[PDB]
Amino acid sequence: LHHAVIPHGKGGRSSVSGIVATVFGATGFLGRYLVNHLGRMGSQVIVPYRCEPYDTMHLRPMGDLGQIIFMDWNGRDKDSIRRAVEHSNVVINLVGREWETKNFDFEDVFVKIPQAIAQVSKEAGVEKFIHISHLNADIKSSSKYLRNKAVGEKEVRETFPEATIIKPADIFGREDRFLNYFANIRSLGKKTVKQPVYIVDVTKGIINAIKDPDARGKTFAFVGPNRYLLFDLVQYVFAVAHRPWTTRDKVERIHTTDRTLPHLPGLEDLGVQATPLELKAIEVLRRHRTVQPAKTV
Template identity: 30%
Template sequence: MSSQPRRVAAQAHQAGVERLAHVSGIGSDVASPSLYIRKRGEGELVVRTAFADATIIRPAVMFGPDDAFLTIVLKLLRRLPIYPMFGRGLTRLQPAYVGDVAEATARALQGTETHAITYECGGPRVYSYKEFLRAVAHEAGLKPKLIPIPFAAWHALAWFAEMLPSPPVTRNQVELMQVDNVSSPQMPGFGELGISPYSVEEMLQEILWDH
């Protein structure tokens, strides 16, 4: 995974490109026991090695129309009167609208900052996973029963699911849901880029209308 960012950064540097943005993710960590999270951290390192002044954009979990996060959650809430949660639903999330992240990336590249800088872009509200599910269900007029499922059971389920052509859940997803996905108050983000991010509730109305 880190070889492609390395190639892009190296070729950009060799071509004399002045500004480069690498979109990573909140929580990227080269020391993580999760291979997926570790590879994202390694991707940041190799980009900065090849292009020292590259801008790193770390969005929280992103959502938008026809995405693989909010749209899927909404479909499952509609179909399942009993909804299986990851763990006890305590993992903290700060979902960011994909359009806001795109705008943040563009503004970061157009800004006056020319030295290496990392932005962490989280939405306007921090939810627990359970709160997030209840908020989505409320906007959709649904009242599902949320059932906690231990992460160990999810890992076993994902291991078997990955044998299918289109697995409904993967081990990467389970690993990500075990770690809080919230921007650090010490890091610059949407505010420093002059962006007032959209909330899940605001964008969900458009998604509900479309579907």
Template identity: 35%
Template sequence: MDMADRLVTIFGGGGFVGTTLVQHLAKTGVRVRVAVRHPNSAMHLKPLGDVGQVQVVQANIRDEKSVRAAVKGADAVVNLVGILHESGKQKFNSVQAIGAAIVARTAAAEGVSKLVHMSALGADADSNSKYASSKARGEDAVRHYFPSATILRPSVIFGPGDDFFNRFAALASRFPVMPVIFGDSKFQPVYVGDVAEVIVRAVSDAALAGKTLELGGPKVYSMREILELVCKESRNDLPLIDVPAPAAWVMGFFLGMLPSPMVTIDQLRLLQKDNVVSDGAEGLASLGIAGTPVEAIIPSYMMHWRPKGQFADQIEG
């Protein structure tokens, strides 16, 4: 089939990962249908392809009727939908478990040939984190309804517009000290462009059908090392202060009640455990992707958090 004749539906395509994925897919010539709850929030994606190549439609993965309409006629489906904290009707179970089941079941019923499902490292049905346990239930549902699906488990994903390094940089720009919570916990940040490349391959490569891929970058960092790097690249020379666990839980309780919580109790439960690729797991290396180093990318957007702005180096020079 000619690439221009193929249609890929992306649920949650209007977000951080979705925007990069649409760019990568558009370059291959496929038609892209972006299914989001609020279409007006994803109109910035239409210019990423040729005229008419990128279509934005309304869909909510909690609503099977809208999912079916978004999947109709698609050759491949990618589900990127996930939440970091609960709000209103957007609950971990309804979005990351039940929603994942609806997408997989509907894709199978509509005869879709490829399904790529975004999960996360740390997905564990026995976890005390609602996020992690719901991700695991979502994986189980996908495997049940669509056994040949490709499941991706990334560590934290970074790049311009991420909600990881940018969040800590925002803290560094506003506070006189940088609190360190569970500073020994390990992470293996993976570049959003590398994740998008894996998805593009999974959509077109039959050899990846039925596989679970763990995606991590070329280097493992402790939480303390990540915060040190953020402070360095944002030119905010702050003392790093360890927060004892009891104080961290109290902090998570109160900050989690904010309309846009900076940290929640559930996120603290995730921070307690390492977020790195398992020994022997298939991932970037098995696909021949070297992985993009954090240090090669984050200076390009950490500059916006510098006290003197993006031209700080020139001013200081």
């Protein structure tokens, strides 16, 4: 282990954690809190960004001087991926779109780009790789999202055999598109059962998966502590928010139940206690204001 990557300090902002992290997709929602929790340890966070540099400004106070290296990359340029990962000791993937675009479909975002990142990270000597799938990923799933994400998970597993693949159920938080989706829909109630996971629990799970050497080659299912039906969940969202852009793929995924995978470990086997919805939903939905808790199963 090299002398510059030995940890030092008391784990604060000016400390050294020995984590040289390349977070693909740090400009989004999971990457926000992930770069926050990495940089507050004193980790060398490499942020490959695709967007305008203005849209990366919030990542800049998240660490000490020189501890966030921004650089350009393309999903169809393996040279830029190698230019981003050739010094990192961990590579986290967080590339995702809820909607397919003119230049990237779900096959590009969930299959081609994660396999490219994992292949280049294998042939660059990166120790640790973390992939973020979805809990309901299935080949025979109704939505194209979960089909291509199951395909990309299989490809990441077969091209990086030690890839820590993580299954969040439905991540809620401030900049989420789950509770902010329900508070701004003003779809319906069915027999769909969900257990949504909190974003800080997911971030602590990812960083404890970095820190646990036994999490290599594993597959985790980051689920919340309380399973809810869809209907009383949506009624609880409209009860907290003081209320009386979509596609059919999101309609299929909201009416897709969060499956139970007891053979996979979860948040507790990384040392993270799951934060329930009712302690954070007021914090999420206070912005939407111009409460009896939901029924669990």
